[PDB]
Write a protein that binds this ligand. Structure first.
Ligand SMILES: [Mg+2]
Ligand SMILES: [Mg+2]
Ligand SMILES: [Mg+2]
Ligand SMILES: [Mg+2]
Ligand SMILES: [Mg+2]
Ligand SMILES: [Mg+2]
Ligand SMILES: [Mg+2]
Ligand SMILES: [Mg+2]
Ligand SMILES: [Mg+2]
Ligand SMILES: [Mg+2]
Ligand SMILES: [Mg+2]
Ligand SMILES: [Mg+2]
Ligand SMILES: [Mg+2]
Ligand SMILES: [Mg+2]
Ligand SMILES: [Mg+2]
Ligand SMILES: [Mg+2]
Ligand SMILES: [Mg+2]
Ligand SMILES: [Mg+2]
Ligand SMILES: [Mg+2]
Ligand SMILES: [Mg+2]
Ligand SMILES: [Mg+2]
Lengths: 260, 59, 134
RNA sequence: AUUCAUAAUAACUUUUCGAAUCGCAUGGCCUUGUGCUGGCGAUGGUUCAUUCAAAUUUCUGCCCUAUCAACUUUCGAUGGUAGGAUAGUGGCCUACCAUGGUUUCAACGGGUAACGGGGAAUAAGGGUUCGAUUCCGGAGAGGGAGCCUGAGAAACGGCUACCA
RNA sequence: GAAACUGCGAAUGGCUCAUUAAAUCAGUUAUCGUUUAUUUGAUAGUUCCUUUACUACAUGGUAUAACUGUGGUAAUUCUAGA
């Protein structure tokens, strides 16, 4: 239908945003950016619906135009700028740092992180090509291009990125038994190691995953984001540590903490 | 008809109303661009050369 | 006029908009809701910032009498309220003038008439003044 | 999985891009030229990537109808070669050549008071009936066709023509 | 800071359900079959010339709006000459 679509009917908004049904009609439409529409968290959402700092959308523009919020090191002044998983959000005033990273219910969690950890990030390398003039580059899931990576770096490995500089400072191969964050599907949010990879030439390798409760599940490759070693993550995980409990187990927890 | 005359050396302009189809007749079949000597149109205009540049019809 | 009691719950210090924001939970026995002027006049003398930098609204009084719950903001300065407050709110208080204008559709009609003209206009006044001879 | 990414040779081109732009601050440096340097960020720019897209596209799934049995090539129907055209595959179009393609497992034709879907109504179950209509997709702007601009329209609160 | 030029937008949105029966649409695929403003991240030492009497780079060309002024038509977001 003639061109790029520019609105987003609330209800067609992604659910992991947790917008309410009524009160309005539209949701914010994620600008183009580093993260895909449906796997993103627009600044407006974060500054108002999670952090509760703004009440209006009007006050989000107001907060932002004073260059208070800055993403992955840089300032950013787009109301509906597409923030995403692994990105780092900073409020210099209020001396606060955040990393965008998932729940166990598949949502973006509000997660305070320390000032130092707040100055690097992880990137799934999405493709590694030979670029013009023979210079090899990598591309990470958030759409950074990095020239001259390590020759050992291949697609699906994760990558530790400065932020202050453009450069890579470390990487982790996609191997049997490396800490993994699941980014997509039902098991979105779950975390756990890797048992083994199903191959399937010509479409969708499967990655068999086990967590630190000896619980097992599967996802398409695509949805698997290496993030360290059994034990050693390379970033701090949210409380819950991506383990997922039955509705029973979660009931019992919630009604175990009961006596005021 | 009405004449709209400009002296573009002085950036001046003023209009002249010519009745008598005989004096008017000098401009007929002359196009835009074509030059037109003056005396024919008026005895004031003797000497003058006019370039036809455009104009309007009725309506 | 019966003790009242202004309670402030769920409180957030909000630097990036220069204000402290909170719920205002007013118990008012034998006093049918308290009013907003009273609530800024009082909350001022609580958050040490003076009335005309305190903003308050929301407020519906509880079913069956007794209580109203609203929302409050207190700016670090009156310079900061007057610049981070919605302008209708400043109007309610007396810190800004309702600069009222033509009807919304009187305005539109002026816009559309104005679209018929190309250039300043006054050229068209004089040319149309010539018409007053034909 | 490639004639892939990338590079090398010989040339080609009515030669694409390679900053004659704008805002803040005015500082260093010595051979004292108003010399030579130089801060923060705007707008632009070619190529690649990314993001918002688009366009085509594989597999399977539609209501009634035989008082519709053969259908398809007129003036492409089905395939092959080459080209042309396209953003690009492709009978998309053209030229040559061949005679193919679908069908009782219902083609083809007709009807639909037919936009499709998420869904709605009815509660033993199996079902029956409905969905113009809050969300997704498609299509249209009185009817047809054509097209300008532009990244994107065969656009109608754009233009052009014919009809009403 | 009017007007006007330049840039961007007017292809979103909103409405309707006429057409449409392998079409659309759904679920599922493919691009090793293409275009892609924008957002984001990368990306440019080469431009002249038989290569000493040398090319504006301390920066090359006009032609136009608005405007001024002379006009036309019953008449429109008509517009002509200077
Ligand atoms: Mg937006
Ligand atoms: Mg594939
Ligand atoms: Mg208005
Ligand atoms: Mg105007
Ligand atoms: Mg090649
Ligand atoms: Mg100086
Ligand atoms: Mg019959
Ligand atoms: Mg052929
Ligand atoms: Mg035959
Ligand atoms: Mg039958
Ligand atoms: Mg119909
Ligand atoms: Mg139906
Ligand atoms: Mg429907
Ligand atoms: Mg109908
Ligand atoms: Mg249309
Ligand atoms: Mg009608
Ligand atoms: Mg016809
Ligand atoms: Mg049309
Ligand atoms: Mg329209
Ligand atoms: Mg629409
Ligand atoms: Mg010229």
């Amino acid at each position: 239908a003639r061109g790029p679509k520019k609105h987003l009917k609330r209800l067609a908004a992604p659910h992991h945003w947790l917008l309410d049904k009524l009160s309005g009609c539209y949701a914010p439409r994620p600008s183009a950016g580093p993260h895909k529409l449906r796997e993103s968290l627009p600044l407006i959402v974060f500054l108002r619906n999670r952090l509760k700092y703004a009440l209006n959308g009007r006050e989000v523009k107001a907060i932002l135009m004073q260059r208070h919020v800055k993403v992955d090191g840089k300032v950013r002044t787009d109301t509906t700028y597409p923030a995403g998983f692994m990105d780092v959000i900073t409020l210099d005033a209020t001396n606060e740092n955040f990393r965008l990273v998932y729940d166990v219910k598949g949502r973006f969690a509000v997660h305070r992180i320390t000032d130092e950890e707040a100055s690097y990030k992880l990137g799934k390398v999405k493709k590694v090509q030979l670029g013009k003039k023979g210079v090899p580059y990598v591309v990470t899931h958030d759409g950074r291009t990095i020239r001259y990576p390590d020759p050992n770096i291949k697609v699906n490995d994760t990558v530790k990125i400065d932020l202050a500089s453009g450069k890579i400072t470390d990487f982790i191969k996609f191997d049997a038994g490396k800490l993994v964050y699941v980014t997509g599907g039902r098991n979105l949010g779950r975390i756990g190691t890797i048992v083994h990879k199903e191959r399937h030439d010509g479409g969708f390798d499967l990655v068999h995953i086990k967590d630190s409760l000896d619980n097992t599940f599967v996802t398409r490759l695509n949805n698997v984001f290496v993030i360290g070693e059994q034990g050693k993550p390379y970033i701090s995980l949210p409380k819950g540590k991506g383990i997922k409990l039955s509705i029973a187990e979660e009931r019992d927890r919630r009604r175990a903490q009961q006596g005021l | 008809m009405k004449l709209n005359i400009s002296y573009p050396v002085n950036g001046s302009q003023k209009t002249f109303e010519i009745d008598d189809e005989h004096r008017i007749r000098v401009f007929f079949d002359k196009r835009i661009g074509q030059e037109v000597d003056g005396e024919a149109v008026g005895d004031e205009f003797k000497g003058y050369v006019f370039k036809i540049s455009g104009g309007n019809d009725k309506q | 006029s019966d003790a009242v009691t202004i309670r402030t719950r769920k409180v957030i210090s909000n630097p990036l908009l220069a204000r402290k924001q909170f719920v205002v939970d007013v118990l008012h026995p034998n006093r049918a809701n308290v009013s907003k002027d009273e609530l800024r006049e009082k909350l001022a003398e609580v958050y040490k910032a003076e009335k005309d930098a305190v903003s308050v609204f929301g407020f519906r009084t509880q079913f069956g009498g007794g209580k109203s719950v609203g929302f409050g903001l207190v700016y670090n300065s009156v310079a900061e309220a007057k610049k981070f407050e919605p302008t209708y709110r400043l109007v309610r208080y007396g810190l800004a003038e309702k600069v009222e204008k033509a009807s919304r559709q009187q305005r539109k009609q002026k816009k559309n008439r104005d679209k018929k003209i190309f250039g300043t206009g006054k050229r068209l006044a004089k040319k149309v003044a010539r018409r007053n001879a034909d």
